[PDB]
């Protein structure tokens, strides 16, 4: 009756469950910066879109060459001329 399970600080272990949520956020912030100074007219696309079909997959390995390469090219190739998905 008045003897339920002994739970401590469940909420504390709830924040630790936000790894892919926070990471995604940081990635973008740190992303736009890599390209902002390099390819300003793409960062917005690279950061927002980032997770694209092709250029996206690679993104999994946020690198200086690949990323900055498949980011600026793809961003400049498609540009804001986006519409569908």
Q: Where are the domains of the chain?
A: 10-85
Taking CA atoms, 37 is separated from 7, 30, 33, 75, 77, in Å, by 50, 12, 7, 14, 18
Q: Domain 10-85: give its CATH superfamily.
A: c-terminal domain of poly(a) binding protein (1.10.1900.10)
Method: NMR
83: left (phi over 0), alpha (psi -120 to 50) or beta: alpha
CA atoms 73, 78, 79, 83: torsion sign = negative
């Amino acid at each position: 009756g008045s003897s339920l399970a002994s739970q401590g600080q469940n909420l504390s272990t709830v924040l630790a469950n936000l790894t892919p949520e926070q990471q995604k956020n940081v990635l973008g912030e740190r992303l736009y910066n890599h390209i902002v100074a390099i390819n300003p007219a793409a960062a917005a696309k690279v950061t927002g879109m980032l997770l694209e079909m092709d250029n996206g997959e690679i993104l999994n390995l946020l690198d200086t060459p690949g990323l900055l390469d498949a980011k600026v090219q793809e961003a400049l190739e498609v540009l804001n001329r986006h519409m569908n998905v």
